[PDB]
Amino acid sequence: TRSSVLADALNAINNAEKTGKRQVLIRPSSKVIIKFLQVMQKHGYIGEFVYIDDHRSGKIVVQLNGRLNKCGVISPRFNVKIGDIEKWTANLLPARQFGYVILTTSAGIMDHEEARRKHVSGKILGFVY
Amino acid sequence: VLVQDLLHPTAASEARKHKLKTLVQGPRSYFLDVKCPGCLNITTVFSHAQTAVTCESCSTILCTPTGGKAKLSEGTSFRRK
Amino acid sequence: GRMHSAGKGISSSAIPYSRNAPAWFKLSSESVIEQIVKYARKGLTPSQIGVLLRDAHGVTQARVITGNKIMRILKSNGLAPEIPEDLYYLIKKAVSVRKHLERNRKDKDAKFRLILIESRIHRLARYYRTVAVLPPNWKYESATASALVN
Amino acid sequence: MENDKGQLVELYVPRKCSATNRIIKADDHASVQINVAKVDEEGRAIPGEYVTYALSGYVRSRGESDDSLNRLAQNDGLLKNVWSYSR
Amino acid sequence: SLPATFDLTPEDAQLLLAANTHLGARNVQVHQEPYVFNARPDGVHVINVGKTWEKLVLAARIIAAIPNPEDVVAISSRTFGQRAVLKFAAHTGATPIAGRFTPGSFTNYITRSFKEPRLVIVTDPRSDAQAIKEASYVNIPVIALTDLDSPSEFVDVAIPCNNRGKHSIGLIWYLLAREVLRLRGALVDRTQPWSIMPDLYFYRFP
RNA sequence: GACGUUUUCAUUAAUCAAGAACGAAAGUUAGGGGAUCGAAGAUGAUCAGAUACCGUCGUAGUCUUAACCAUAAACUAUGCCGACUAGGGAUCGGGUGGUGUUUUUUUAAUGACCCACUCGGCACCUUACGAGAAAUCAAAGUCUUUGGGUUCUGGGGGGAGUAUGG
RNA sequence: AUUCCAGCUCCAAUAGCGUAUAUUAAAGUUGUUGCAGUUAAAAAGCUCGUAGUUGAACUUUGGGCCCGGUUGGCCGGUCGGA
């Protein structure tokens, strides 16, 4: 079972990048994963990607430039206050002056500093670089 | 794989590789619109048939069902698509 | 991954992208609907309907050129089955296993093979009590799993 | 990278892989720097002006060492259809 | 790049097709399809020899750039090209190596057989086993030859040919050496022959 | 079970407290034969502990019938459903026929083949990218760059799987 | 006998230094963060199963009209500031 399609996402791109690819075929995929990857392309850790479609789940193809070292889901999807995101920074991020945990929230999906900017904090999704 | 999108591969490389593993899904088998030697009425049996066709004029069993695809009785005119 | 079997399997019916009648089949929807209504009043289970007269009359499926699926067809006709198609034939498997259970008493795999079928009938009875297509007063029982098919 | 007024930091400003777009460190004992001198009319060498390649360690270890350099000779203007873009 | 001086010509394709290197190797570990075209109907692979020509086109770009002809090194443990490297050497300026590769040759800077190369051209990269393995320590490019069971590991210039018959190895040696001497500069064309034979770099039977 | 299918349900699902089937060898009650050897045993051993390995008969048992038991180095010493990667010549269960080669249905029929291709089971060995302390492992991976889901165990050696209780 | 009794002599903290138990820390030896089960203690005999714990994919993008809170300064008309 693919209990989290978002988990049997980027683990696939771990098994592509650590094994040295430039793309992988992600199926299934959701708007969870679609907006997740739009956020990642907006940060530009990964590069250009395309959603191709069937009358089934759907596929995504990514064209990065290497800078995706590691991502991962932080399942279970913990619910975080404003001051407590910075706890989650120093546990599992490389340095202060880069690196993004991202969040799903009632303001959609954005990293924890846009949460600091647009002044909410919501449920965890993953850590991305 | 190096630099090509997978809308832009060598196309037919994965085309026979077990229908659903291809870049999208497309079924294996085919349709046939053929006519019996007893009526010359177009009797569309499926390629991978599971039903032994009694003729529409005769009572002749004009196919024998087998796995994979079925085994017709000879006398069926074929044509393309 | 199979339940109750410990094996891997792919029994394929895959569907390409396009929805409507694509290229060649020249009948209207009314023609194939009245064909399926002809098939439906023959008084057999929907497996036996499809396996014969999707294969002998050029019918693609009962959903693409037709529009209304088969258990929706029979309930608009008054010939909707009691327990639809698959719980009945799993009770038929239970019939076969339980009639071989007293041909010989110590067929020990038959004690193991009834449990899997009985468990899947429990799940199907529970799912058909979920969406309320089975009446939730009756319960499946081995004292009704050999007098209800044949 | 830069102090209170600028003034870039940490000598040995490194160089980068052009196959996996990874980095090449001064430890490394597989990274090769390739000097491809040009050609022209009369077709000899022009020795000194270079298409400098660099090949790091993971490509040379884990089959995929060769085809990853067919792409760079293709997409710079050095070789023609040695690298099937339509792979 | 690819000048008007030289590209694919059917008069050096006299030489390669006269060697019958449509007889490749017979089973392929799958890293080795940028240069095959098809196989003869019992399954022996046919080579895109114009791209094998482009291999020597960039192989001489690699060689003639160095302001040190002494820094050119060629290895040949396979017997066939063991003449050919000397046939290269006093022609080109490369220091020749043939025979047994001394274990710890690029290791042990104290011993006698320690070379300081800037460029190394190998001949048989299975028969030059510890010349493939132990050479990628001191960061050396590996100009190699690649039949269809030959290593995709540690190489970067996979020149497709055969190694069954004494003509193929010295043939592609000569086809590179002619234009290496013409990148250093004596003559021009490809339908034009060089002053000395392609027969020259081949293996005697003493 | 595999495989083929443009047949039917449209989420009916994964494991698993509690609960329930099965269960080697051995052992446990009531019977059938009672051929085979044979834990115990009854005999001969036979010389100091070259060492006591020898040999011969053997109730039950081994084989079954109406039932237990619920124990293994029950071990591939690796719980079960997910993801991908190697790289291969064969296997076996299925599906296909090359202006494809021969007995002969009549060049490729019954069958079987070289060259290809697919999913199922049993395996092997490579460089180990990843590990591990290490033997080794394509999973004993994708874990300090620590979070796909779920169940049962371990906390120095003993004392001890002992006492005690259920 | 650098390790014994002493003589020296020296080393620390300094009106302050020891000792006894108890807890905390280092102790990823309690581990949600954050362990470990092939051989080091630890995967059970293998299925069925309920409670619990999770559970496939889909629902309003791209761009125009301006408002310009903030900055780059060739402007420097204020000579640290719009």
Domain boundaries, chain A: 1-68, 69-129
Angle between helices C46-53 and C29-40 (to 10 degrees): 130
Nearest-CA distance B19 → chain D (Å) = 21
Which residue is associated with the tokens 């050496």? E177
* Sheet strand arrangement including A100-105: A71-73, A123-128, A100-105, A108-111
- Which residues touch D70 (CB under 8 Å, ≥6 apart)? B2, D79, D82, D83, E34
Instruction: Confirm if A116 and A32 have CB atoms less than 8 A apart.
Output: no
- The DSSP secondary structure of A37-86, one letter per residue, reads HHHHHHHTSS-EEEEE--SSS-EEEEE--S----EEE-TTT-B--STTHH
List the 6-25 stretch of C: residues with Cβ below 8 A of B.
12, 14-17, 24
- What sign does the dihedral C71-C76-C77-C81 (CA atoms) show? positive
Residue numbers in B near C12 (CB within 8 A): 19-20
Give Rg (Cα) of chain D. Answer: 17
Domain A1-68 and domain A69-129 have a common topology: no
Q: Tell me the domains of chain E and their CATH numbers.
A: 12-206 (3.40.50.10490)
Resolution (angstroms) equals 3.8
Neighbour tally for C5: CB within 10 Å: 9
Method: cryo-EM
For residue A121, the SS3 value is coil
Which residue from A minimizes the CA distance to D1?
A: A97
CB pairs under 8 A between D and E: 112
CATH of C81-150, one of 3.30.70.580, 1.10.287.10, 1.10.260.40, 3.10.20.30: 1.10.287.10
C133 contact to strand G (CB, 7 A limit): no
From the centroid of its chain, how far is CA E85?
10
Which residue is associated with the tokens 């683990």? A11
CATH of D1-87, one of 3.90.550.10, 3.40.50.720, 3.90.930.60, 3.30.1230.20: 3.30.1230.20
C4 contact to strand G (CB, 7 A limit): yes
Q: What are the boundaries of each domain within chain C?
A: 26-80, 81-150
| CATH code of the domain in which B38 resides | 2.20.25.100
For residue E75, the SS3 value is strand
CATH of A1-68, one of 3.40.50.720, 3.40.50.300, 3.30.1370.30, 1.10.3720.10: 3.30.1370.30
Rounded CA–C1' distance between A20 and G2, in angstroms: 63
Residue numbers in D near A66 (CB within 8 A): 20-22
Instruction: Confirm if A120 and A106 have CB atoms less than 8 A apart.
Output: yes
Backbone torsions φ then ψ of E38, nearest 5 degrees: -160, -165
Q: Name the nearest CA neighbour of C87 among C38, C138, C37, C36.
A: C138
Which chain A residues 14-33 have CB under 7 A to strand G?
28-32
From the centroid of its chain, how far is CA E160?
10
Q: Domain range spanning residue B69?
A: 1-81
Which chain A residues 14-33 have CB under 7 A to strand F?
14-16, 18-19
Nearest-CA distance A17 → chain C (Å) = 28
Mutate to test the interface with D, among E33, E58, E118, E154 (most CBs of D within 10 A): E58
Q: Which nucleotide is nearest to B48 (CA to C1')?
A: F5
Backbone torsions φ then ψ of A101, nearest 5 degrees: -70, 140
Which residue from B minimizes the CA distance to D75?
A: B3
Instruction: Confirm if C63 and B53 have CB atoms less than 8 A apart.
Output: no
What tokens does E102 get? 């001394």
Instruction: Confirm if B50 and B65 have CB atoms less than 8 A apart.
Output: yes
Rounded CA–C1' distance between C122 and F19, in angstroms: 16
DSSP code at position D5: T
Q: Tell me, which fold does domain A69-129 have in CATH?
A: Dna Ligase; domain 1 (3.30.1490)
Tell me if A20 and D21 make a contact (CB, 8 A cut-off).
Answer: no
